[PDB]
Each structure stands twice: as C-alpha cells, then as structure tokens.
Design a protein around this motif. Structure first.
Motif: not given
Lengths: 49, 117, 49, 117
Positions: B64-65, B68, B71-72, B75, B98, B101-102, B104-105, B108-109, B112
């Motif tokens: 799934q990563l 992800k 998609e990141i 977008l 937007a 925020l993305l 930063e996201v 973080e992804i 992880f």
C-alpha cells in the motif's frame, strides 16, 4: 485391601471392589477349564482351614 | 502422555522405599529432567505460528505504501498546476495550505517507511 | 483379522499363534502437534464349537 | 496539524458545492482517503510489534538437543538391560511401560525438531 505393592499393601474404596468382582467374573467366563473348578474346591477347603 | 509420566513415577516411587539403589534415583531424576525439557519445548514450538502470521500481515503495508507515494506525487503536481492558473485569493490561500500540508505528510510517510523496514 | 496399535517383537512370547502385518500409520490428534504411530493387523485361525 | 485537515476540508467543500469540477471531486476523494490512511497509521502507532517476546531465551536453547540425545539411548539401553535382568512382575511391567513411553517421546521430540528447523 484390594491390591498389593512392594513394601506393604494397598487400600481402596467400594467402587474398586465392585469393579474387581465384575472383572473376576468376566475373566471366569472367558477362561473356563476344569483346573479352575478343582483349584477352587481345594483352595476353598484350605481357606476354610 | 502426562498421565503416563505420573503413573510411571508413582510406580517407581514404591520400589525405592522397599529397596536400596542409587541407579533408580538417577533414573527418576533423568525422567523428570526429560519431562521438563519436553514440556518446555512445547510452548517454544507452539509460538512459531504467530511469528509467521506477523510476517504475513507485515507484507501488505509494503504494497500500500508504494501506491500512497504515487497518489502523493500525482496530487502534488496537479495541485501545483491548478495553483498556477487561478485568479482568486480564496483559491490561492487554500492551495498554499494544501502544498504545505502535503509536504509535511510526505516527509512523515517517508520517515515511517524507513522505520518500518 | 483384527486391528491393533501395539508393536510386536517387544513381548514376542505372548504372540505365538498369530501373524502380524504392518498395514498403515495413524494420526493421533492431541493438544499439540502430530504423532503418527504405525498400525498393525493380527491374523489367526480358529474354530470354536 | 489536524486543524489543518478540517480547515482544508471545509474550505474545499465551500469552494466545491458552489461550483463543481471533475478534478475538484477527485481531490476531495483523494484527500479523504489520505485522511483515513493517516488516522489508521496513527492508530497503529501506539501498538507497533511485540519485539520483547521476539527476543526471548533462545541463545543456549538451541544447543541442548545434542545434550538430550546424549542420554536418550544411554537410558534406553539401561532400561533394556535392567528389564532383561529383572525377575519380578512389578518391575517388568514398569520397565515395559517406560520403554514404550520413551519411544513415543523420542519420536515426538525428533518430529518437532525436524519440523521447526
């Protein structure tokens, strides 16, 4: 007193006695022979003595 | 098997209080040591399934990563393109938030993702 | 012909009028694991009354 | 960071339901999916895996197999000899039962040892 073990004798309850009697009757049925009755008769006499 | 062990030990206990031999003492100690080793190995071989279950469940996140990340990036690029050709302040403010925020996201992804392996 | 689980030639003098074959293995379901133990067949000839 | 999530969602909803576009709904759906993905990751954060149980006593645990095999046939031979020598009826039955038990346990331990490795 229903059993024997090295260095003493053993004890049990009524259920052991009844099961032992039933097993003895079953084995008497399964292993019939004239030797059995002869031994029983003379052993009974000796036990009475 | 445990019932067989207890019957065997109970029967062997009565040959010691009516005789005398160190061989049977050592033999009984060896049976009890073997019983302890076997029933210790029991849970050790039982626990093996959970490790494989965890390994199997850990494999789906890896796949799934990747989606992800796709998609990141898609977008991000389309949001930047939409920002390029707008003429309304509401639009611009929303797009600023937007992008921030993305970013930063995504950071973080990635952190992880590196941690998981 | 009768099914059995006990291994002969451990107490061989008991079985003197029998023929023993090894006919398969049995999966004993327990709390943990699998303990396949072979399975034997006893064959004998009689005539009763 | 969360307040950014709700603020962006609310602003984009106000932007959208006033005027609709394909990509606009596309970003709404993609954002929402990412939102739940981050929430699920956060739910997975405070649990992780149980590495404490993954590093239990296993160092010396592996080497005792040969140690047990050292006395397996030793005791089986001792039992065979003592069964051969004895004369009583109690001892003979006890030794026969012990021999059968030991055969069963030896198979069992060999089977699990082969399966685990």
């Amino acid at each position: 007193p229903i059993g024997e073990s090295p260095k003493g004798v053993e004890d049990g309850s009524i259920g052991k006695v009844c099961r032992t009697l039933l097993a003895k009757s079953v084995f008497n049925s399964l292993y019939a022979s004239p030797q059995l009755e002869g031994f029983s008769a003379e052993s009974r006499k000796l036990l009475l003595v | 098997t445990v019932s067989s062990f207890q019957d065997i030990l109970l029967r062997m206990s009565k040959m010691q209080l009516g005789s005398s031999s160190e061989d049977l003492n050592g033999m009984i100690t060896q049976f009890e040591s073997l019983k302890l080793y076997r029933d210790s190995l029991g849970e050790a071989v039982m626990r093996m399934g959970d490790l494989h279950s965890l390994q199997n469940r850990n494999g789906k996140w890896r796949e799934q990563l990747g989606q992800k990340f796709e998609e990141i990036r898609w977008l991000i690029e389309e949001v930047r393109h939409r920002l390029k050709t707008t003429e309304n302040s509401f639009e611009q403010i929303t797009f600023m938030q937007a992008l921030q925020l993305l970013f930063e996201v995504e950071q973080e992804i990635r952190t992880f993702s590196f941690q998981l392996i | 012909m009768e099914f059995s689980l006990t291994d002969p030639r451990l107490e061989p003098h008991k079985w003197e009028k029998y023929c023993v074959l090894e006919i398969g293995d049995m999966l004993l379901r327990s709390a943990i694991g699998q303990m396949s133990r072979p399975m034997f067949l006893y064959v004998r000839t009689n005539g009763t009354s």
